[PDB]
Design a protein around this nucleic acid. Structure first.
Lengths: 190, 173, 78, 159, 205
RNA sequence: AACGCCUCUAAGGUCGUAUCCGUGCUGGACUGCAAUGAUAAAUAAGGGGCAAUUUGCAUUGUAUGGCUUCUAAACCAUUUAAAGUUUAUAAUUUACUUUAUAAACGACAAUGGAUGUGAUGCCAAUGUAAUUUGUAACAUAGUAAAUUGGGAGGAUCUUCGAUCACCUGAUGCCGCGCUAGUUACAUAUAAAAGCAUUAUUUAAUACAAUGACAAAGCCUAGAAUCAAUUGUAAACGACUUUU
RNA sequence: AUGUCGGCUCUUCCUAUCAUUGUGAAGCAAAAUUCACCAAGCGUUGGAUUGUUCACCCAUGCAAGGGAACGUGAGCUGGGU
RNA sequence: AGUCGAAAUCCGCUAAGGAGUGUGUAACAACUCACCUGCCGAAGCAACUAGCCCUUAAAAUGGAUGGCGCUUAAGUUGUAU
RNA sequence: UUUAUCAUAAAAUAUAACUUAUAGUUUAUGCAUUUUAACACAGAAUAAAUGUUAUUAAUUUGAUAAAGUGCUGAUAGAUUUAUAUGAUUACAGUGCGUUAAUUUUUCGGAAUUAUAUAAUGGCAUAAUUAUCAUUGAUUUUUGUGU
């Protein structure tokens, strides 16, 4: 019905310094910078002379103002991505063959093998500014660091989406590497 | 057209077993004088016996609503025929003039439901004050102070030069 | 737009072009005859946006389409 | 919110495309997405409604109630003193090619467009006003410092 | 130059819609026109890419079956995607409407003098006057690459060549205006100089 | 996200087919385009380029009523119909970069234009048109030009692309001709009696363009094909080769 | 006066998918199979009898789709009528 | 034994606990719902109905809103000059 | 309607105190000040904005008609041997031959009555034909007076 206003205001804290610039948002904190654009959604983004930032849509129809409540939630991920970081975890369930995953320097991509006793040495790269080292302190666990949530998660679903068992059953051949913990890196303890 | 408003009055011409037959009146929105006088009979061939000529049209007049610069929000009652589907409705518009918010109905009812205007009947039209308007697209146009910075023109495309020289940079801020 | 081409109605438009011959003297003020002109007169307006019709003396041979004719400024209302 | 033009009562708007072209009206209320009321008493426009695509907006709000009659808009229109601060609005001078460059009669044009040769014949000989590296001197300025002594001292020639 | 206007009307193709710029140009070219449209890899098409993918991929399967060489020659530049339009809008089977495409040169990647000559915008066919919010558009840059145009990165490097020496010809001209505004000072006491133009302009002083 | 929550989706990013598109491969805008090599006979005379051409005739194209001219100097560096753009300022910095602060503009009148965006001409007349008109006086401003060696500089089916524009060594001395304003003075021209003049609108001046002649120096001295041969080729042509 | 069955030869096209590539589901443990989606790119045979087309039979095959100009007689053949 | 399926059948306890709600759990039992209040606090939930859009919607030369192209339209419905 | 005047209402937002909130601010976690586009119907007062009634100022408003109202622009067209066997004349329009004052410019013009009507329209009245509705109105034949 082309309703008039639906604006959200992200609550910027004290430690991080943001800037919307004509729509692109560059937020600087502890762990780095996450300069990302929204030159496609076409809101009216605005830091009202304060710390905070407010998106605002005028006369968008119904689908348009659904996308207000996401860009105010993309931003507060790029808040947490630079003060606490984004870290997933992998657990690598298997039945009979131990999935001998490895990575190294540099070779902070990955190099996993013995799925499922196949000779195909599967190799999964990582998104930039994002590293994989194998998790210590645990049997067959992994750690994907990084600040951008989608460059953590999307780079940590490639290790999940292959390996998958092809051409067989999947409700009995339950092997693979799956995500167990989607955590921060710092807050509050880790 | 723009659907002026009339008040059209009937007679049942007075044959001798009953003189003075009892003078019914209507409220008609039609584009013109004479089509108002033939909505009247289509809407007399449902309520009274009474056709032409068994009846007359005693004085009609076009009426010129009362406050043409007040910002009243109308609420019209309606009856309309679908493809299969004669249905009641109840619709609401904001307009200064009553016949401007019946013609606001027609061009909206005709668009949104395909509703060709011979299968729409007006069965009440009244001004509805506020806090009775239901219709969400009305009652967002209520709250003074209403800020609403829709930087709006038509932004005439393009201007007096077809092969212009200047690249019109809409926003201008 | 149509108020613009409503200015030129009545003006002797001319279509000017050339030909190989002279075949003729300078009879009135000196004539070389290498240039041919078909005189006309703008008649009415045509478009809804300021095009215009003009009846000529003979009839414009249509390989003249897209070539310039000269609408004169005379006979002038002010 | 970069505080753009708002359609608010009574944000002062100058109309174009319709029959109120060249009129500074005041909004009174909002009827629609696309229409408003309109009331400019001093500029000579009574209370109409108006298609919002036709009127363009200025930086001038003024305070009334939204139910105001014209007489108190007229009271407010003069009280905040629009009339004197609009004919100096920083591109309301650039309105006034409408009063000066529009039709600019042919009892105006020649004089106003013959001096552009006056101005320019004194401008192009105000070129090679040069500092950029030559300085100094760029021979054949043995002859031209005599010509360039008529820029500096200038008594009488070079030098 | 000299003509019915000039002997050219150079149009930048950047940001314009492909078919509204065509029917403006195919009308103007029948008026006796001479246009020369540049940067054709930048013409925007409406709809998203997998709409116009499918439509150019349907216009290339229309080939003759008896002998495909006779059948519709499907040109894959961006400037021939646009020149194909201005032939649907021109009577190209006549000796009048064949001289109307011989005024049309159409380029893609703005060369050779159409890089110093002033080129103009057609606001009737601009995208951001016509096409709404929320509505995806395309460019004929990527359409021609994904249908086999082997010179996309050819001309992108040639663009950055003439983008690069544009900054050399603007910093010639940015400081040169700074000389004029100093050259404007010495003439304020010329004789009675500027008064006759400023009394009709004065809004730029 | 809508829909306080879930959700592969609405916006956004991804994974991805024996398909599709391209490469690789075969034909080539029949006769597209670029690069290149030679550039005739003669050597007495000629013939062929250089060439604006200098030297005239004479035409076309044109600014066509002195100039209904134009300029072949720019307005973002992913994009977004509110979307933002410039401007200083301070820091940053190859960069109008980056960042901050403050302005202006309020998608108006206006800006689709004359910022005539290195600031167009509408002319040096100091009587300006279908010719040019002279000389002093005074004020400020004060150009435009012509000869010698090294560099950096410039290529998108070109309006002239082995040249080229700037710049230094440096030759030299226009001191030929600048201009604007105020005032004076010296002449010449110009009038087609048509007084309801126009006509197949001439045409110039000038610009530019050839064209052809007697007029003008320079430069130039090769090939192809057929016939004969070959046999990598062959119906015939054509192709590969040879004196 | 449009040569009227077939076969032989040879083209291309269509999907209403038989197999192969990519996937989804299963009363999917593996193997084998069935259901469904995107898919026409490459395939889709040798023979006994009969003039026939479908036909059935032997054999090959992890695995033997169906059709279009009643395709095709100055292409042949001439077995059928 | 509250509980594959129940004739019945109330209540007691009590803001709120039923001869009882749950995994194709044979006993007890574990176990959770219903419910209430805490929590937050503006509208929310469902069955319809008909507009355009979609799916349904599959044929053989290459191909047709007549063509180009169009997507705040150059589409569709209601109108205006 | 609108402007305008009236009287009361009853006051739904805007000028017009000071909270709190919010950040940016100072000074030692608070205050001090600064923008509240957080802005407490948070108050007073005002708009008697709004609400009620009534009247209107060049009495204000369009459309719908008629009049020539006053024209200004353009377009195309123009039969004709009207005696090659029958009006070129009826029209009106100009230039000579009562009057008198009135006025104006003074160079014109200018104006003025009675001069004879049936008088037609207007008024009063009589009169009658015939009627929507009938207090009346509409007439009709008129006639008289004015």
């Amino acid at each position: 019905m082309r309703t008039i206003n639906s604006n959200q205001c992200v609550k910027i804290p004290k430690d991080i310094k943001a800037s919307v610039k004509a729509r692109v948002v560059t937020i600087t904190g502890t762990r780095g910078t996450l300069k990302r654009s929204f030159k496609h959604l076409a809101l009216d983004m605005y830091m009202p002379d304060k710390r905070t930032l407010k998106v605002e849509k005028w006369f968008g129809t119904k689908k348009e103002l659904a996308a207000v409540r996401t860009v105010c939630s993309h931003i507060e991920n790029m808040i947490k991505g630079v003060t606490f970081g984004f870290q997933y975890k992998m657990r690598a369930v298997y039945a009979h063959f131990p999935i001998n995953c490895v990575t190294s320097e540099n070779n902070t991509v990955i190099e996993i093998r013995n799925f499922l006793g196949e000779k195909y040495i599967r190799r999964v790269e990582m998104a930039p500014g994002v590293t994989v080292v194998n998790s210590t302190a645990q049997k067959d666990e992994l750690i994907v660091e990084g600040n951008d949530i989608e460059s953590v998660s999307g780079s940590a679903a490639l290790i999940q989406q292959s390996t998958t068992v092809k051409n067989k059953d999947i409700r009995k051949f339950l092997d693979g590497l799956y995500v167990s913990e989607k955590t921060t890196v710092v807050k509050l303890e880790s | 057209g723009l659907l002026k408003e009339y008040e059209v009055v009937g007679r049942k011409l007075p044959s001798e077993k009953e003189p003075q037959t009892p003078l019914y009146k209507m409220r008609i929105f039609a584009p013109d004088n004479i089509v108002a006088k033939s909505r009247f009979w289509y809407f007399l061939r449902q309520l009274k016996k009474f056709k032409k000529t068994t009846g007359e049209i005693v004085s009609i007049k076009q009426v010129y609503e009362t406050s043409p610069v007040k910002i009243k929000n109308f609420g019209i009652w309606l009856r309309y025929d679908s493809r299969s589907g004669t249905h009641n409705m109840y619709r609401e518009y904001r307009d200064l003039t009553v016949g401007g918010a019946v013609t606001q109905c027609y061009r909206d009812m005709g668009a949104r439901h395909r509703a060709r205007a011979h299968s729409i009947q007006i069965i009440k039209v009244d001004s509805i004050p506020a806090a009775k308007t239901r219709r969400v697209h009305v009652k967002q146009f209520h709250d003074s102070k209403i800020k609403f910075p829709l930087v709006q023109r038509v932004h005439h495309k393009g201007n007096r030069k077809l092969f212009s020289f200047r690249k019109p940079r809409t926003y201008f801020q | 737009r149509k108020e613009h081409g409503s200015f030129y109605v009545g003006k002797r438009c001319v279509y000017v072009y050339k030909a190989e011959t002279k075949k003729c003297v300078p009879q009135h003020p000196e004539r070389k005859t290498r240039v041919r002109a078909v005189w006309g007169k703008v008649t009415r307006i045509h478009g809804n946006t300021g095009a215009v019709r003009a009846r000529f003396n003979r009839n414009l041979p249509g390989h003249a389409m897209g070539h310039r004719i000269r609408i004169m400024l005379y006979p002038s209302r002010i | 919110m970069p505080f753009e033009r708002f359609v608010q009562t009574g944000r002062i708007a100058k109309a174009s495309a319709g029959p109120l072209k060249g009129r500074l009206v005041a909004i009174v209320d909002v009827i629609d997405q696309n229409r408003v009321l309109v009331d400019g008493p001093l500029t000579g426009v009574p209370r109409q409604e108006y298609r919002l695509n036709n009127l363009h907006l200025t930086k001038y709000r003024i305070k009334f109630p939204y139910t105001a009659p014209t007489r108190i808009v007229r009271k407010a229109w003069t009280e905040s003193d629009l009339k004197a601060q609009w004919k100096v609005s920083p591109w309301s001078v650039k309105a006034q090619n409408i009063c000066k460059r529009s039709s600019l009669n042919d009892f105006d044009r020649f004089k106003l467009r013959y001096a552009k040769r006056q101005r320019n014949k004194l401008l192009t000989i105000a070129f090679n006003t040069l500092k950029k590296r030559t300085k100094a001197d760029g021979t054949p300025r043995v002859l031209k410092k005599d010509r360039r002594e008529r820029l500096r001292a200038e008594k009488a020639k070079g030098g | 130059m000299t003509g019915l206007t000039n002997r050219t009307v150079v149009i930048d193709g950047r940001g314009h819609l492909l078919g509204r710029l065509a029917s403006v140009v195919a009308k103007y070219l029948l008026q006796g026109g001479k246009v020369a449209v540049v940067r054709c890899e930048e013409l925007n098409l409406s709809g998203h890419f997998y709409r116009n993918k499918i439509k150019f991929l349907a216009y290339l399967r229309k080939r003759c079956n008896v002998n495909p060489a006779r059948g519709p020659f499907h040109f894959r530049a961006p400037s021939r995607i646009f020149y194909k339009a201005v032939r649907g809008m021109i009577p190209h089977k006549t000796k009048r409407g064949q001289a109307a495409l011989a005024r049309l040169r159409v380029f893609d990647g703005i060369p050779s003098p159409y890089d110093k000559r002033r080129r103009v915008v057609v606001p009737i066919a601009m995208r951001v006057l016509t096409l709404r919010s929320d509505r995806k558009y395309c460019q004929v840059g990527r359409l021609s690459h994904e249908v086999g145009w082997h010179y996309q990165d050819v001309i992108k490097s040639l663009e950055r060549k003439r983008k690069a020496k544009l900054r050399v010809t603007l910093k010639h001209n940015r400081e040169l205006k700074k000389l004029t505004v100093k050259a404007r000072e010495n003439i304020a006491k010329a004789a009675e100089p500027f008064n006759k133009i400023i009394k009709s302009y004065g809004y730029e002083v």
